[PDB]
Structure formats: structure tokens, C-alpha cells
A paper describes a structure:
Glucuronoyl esterases (GEs) are α/β serine hydrolases and a relatively new addition in the toolbox to reduce the recalcitrance of lignocellulose, the biggest obstacle in cost-effective utilization of this important renewable resource. The bacterial GE OtCE15A possesses a classical yet distinctive catalytic machinery, with easily identifiable catalytic Ser/His completed by two acidic residues (Glu and Asp) rather than one as in the classical triad, and an Arg side chain participating in the oxyanion hole. As a classical ABH, the reaction catalyzed by OtCE15A was assumed to proceed through a covalent intermediate preceded by an acylation and followed by a deacylation step, both going through a tetrahedral transition state.
To further probe the role of R268, the R268A variant was constructed in silico in the SHED catalytic assembly as the QM region, which can in our simulations interact electrostatically with the MM area. However, in the deacylation step of the R268A variant, the proton transfer was not accompanied by nucleophilic attack. With both substrates the kcat is reduced >80-fold compared to the WT enzyme, and there is also reduction in Km as observed previously with the H408A variant, which would be consistent with accumulation of the CI. Indeed, crystallographic determination of the OtCE15A-R268A structure after soaking with the BnzGlcA substrate clearly shows the formation of a CI, mainly arising from the significantly damaged interactions in TI2. Furthermore, our theoretical results indicated that the conserved active-site arginine, whose side chain is proposed to contribute to forming the oxyanion hole, plays a prominent role in both acylation and deacylation steps, especially in the latter.
Residue numbers in the entry: 33 to 154, 176 to 384, 389 to 427
The structure:
Amino acid sequence: AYTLPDPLVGADGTRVHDRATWQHRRRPELLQLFAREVYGRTPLGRPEGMVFKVTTMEHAALGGAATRKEVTVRFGRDPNAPSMQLLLYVPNAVIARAERAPVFLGLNFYGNHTVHTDPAIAARGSDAQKWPVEQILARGYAVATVYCGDLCPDRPDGLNASVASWLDAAAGDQRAPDAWGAIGVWAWGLSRALDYLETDPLVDASRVAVHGHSALGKAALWAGAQDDRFALVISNESGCGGAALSKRIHGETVARINTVFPHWFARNFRRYDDHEEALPVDQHELLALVAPRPLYVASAEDDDWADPRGEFLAVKAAEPVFRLFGQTGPSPRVNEPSGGALRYHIRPGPHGMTAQDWAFYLAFADEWLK
Ligand code: NA
Ligand code: NA
């Protein structure tokens, strides 16, 4: 309903005509703009006392198909420091051929133990529909995951884990207006998980597909935009403040998300409640920050809350940046992916993450990672 800012027009009106101007001038502008006005600033990268502890390693998980590691990523040296728990499945066929496996990495909503029924994972399997682990493994990809609540609660009435506590305490009684919220913390945790993958000799951290569904897809996008080590970015039905254009004011709006989830974004993002016309950015520019690395955005046909048309139109509005790198986006009809390095599909049915979503993502990763 409101015109989108041009990703190729700088803050001073200069037109960006090449990928070198983009990477060196326009990219840092937009990152700062999304930091200040939407997600909050990421206040640290790698902490100096980060410690990796492999707590379990099972060489014959899932009937022999995968090696399974559970890893404590602790962010201080004191063994009582805050930490997150990474679960990693590696396909044993890939290990057997002395290859480092490409990886699908994403946060989960209900706990590492919910991604598969595997009773050794430290409500089991109750989220299996969104996590076809054996099929990903059979296709030759490792699967790495961390529970989002290790880093920050999902609901505003959630319990704090040690990492959320540490950040909560650091925020005193109130956050600064440009301080990060849950999506920024979630994105940061994905980059710390990638830090671990760099050290694990079973996996190729240069071939990591960072994915997320819904709120954790907001986080995957923000992680991929800030951290260009990620090889490929997948946003499944991330909706408002993820891939959907805020200025379309369709489905969930800025005021609605900030009201129900006041810890997800920066306080500054609340200044755009029922004022999306004033946003100096929109989500097509977040998609653009992933270029030239491959980016997959997908919708569900009945998921009006997420604004599927707004998600597709953000992909289209980001395409000119991808075209600076000679990549192509979508030219769509249901169940027909479209686009080259910048890809979109919309499937029938409700909000969710299905076998067909993953079939499309696996084929995408095959093209770019295998
Ligand atoms: Na590695
Ligand atoms: Na919306």
C-alpha cells in the first residue's frame, strides 16, 4: 500500500550501479538500518571464552545411518557459564567416503529431542513433521540444530535459559532503544553454531544451509544477512518481519507482532506500529543482504497471517540486487519453484513445514552445495 524504498538508492540519493558499490557502501548502510530500526544491534560476535564440549557421540545412530553428537557450546570458561546444546547428525555414508558433509543448520521450537523420536537425545519426536532427519541424511547432508529457548524464550512469558538470563541481566531494567531482541539473539546463536561446525572435522562449515520456519526463519534471514559465512539461506513462511513486506500491511502487522511478541524486535521497531509508511527499509532489503549467496523464500497458500503475496513481492523487489551479481529470481503457480540463486515457491495448505517444502529445499541445496 506504501511504496518500497529502492535497495539501489543510497541514503543520500546516490544510485548503486554495480556490485562493488553495493558490497562496500550500500550493504553496510542497510545492515545498520535493520540493526537500529528493526532487529536491534548485535553487541558481540564470538565471545573470547567460548568452549566446545562433545558430551555424547554415538556412531550407530538411526540404525547405523548417522553418527550423532551432542555438543555443549559454553560462552565462558567457568563451567557454570551460559551455554547452548547443539545436536548434530552426520550421515555415515559421507563419513565412510572420507568427505566432510554439507550441513542443514536451524533452530527448533520445542527442543532438540523433538526433531526425532531417537530416545537417546538428551514429547520426543513430537515435531517430526517439520524435521525429516532421515531423509536429509539419506540425501547426504548433516543435520545440526539448537533449541531456540536455550538462547531466548519464544513466548514473552517463557522461562529464561542461562544465555537468555545473562542477556536479560545485562539489559538491566530496560533495553536500549536499538538493543537486540529475540530474533537477534537467535541469529547470533546460529552464527555460534557455525563456529562449532568450523572445528568439527565431520562437517564442511563452508557448505552450511541455514534454515528456519516462521519466527526461526526470521532469525535465519537475519543470521544469513549478517554472517556471510553461511553458504545458503532458507526462509520457510517467516512472515512479518521476516520475508513479508511490512508496507503491504497484510495479515500480521508491525503493531500486532510487537504487541504479542514485544521481545522479538528492537524497541525502535515499535515506532512503526500502524506507521509502516515511515519505515526507512522493508524486508526486500533484508533478502538483498544475502546476495549473491543463494536464498530460498517459501510460503503456504492458506497462511494469510504471513502474507504470502508480500513474501513473493519482497523476493521480486530484492531481485535487482541479485541481478547486480548476475543471479536470477522468480519470473507463480502452486508447487512450482521459480528462480535461480533467488528462489521462491508457494505450496497449498496451511502454515507449516512439510515434506514437500523440504523436497524443494533439498533439491535447491543439491544445486548449490553438491
Ligand atoms: Na568442519
Ligand atoms: Na504482514
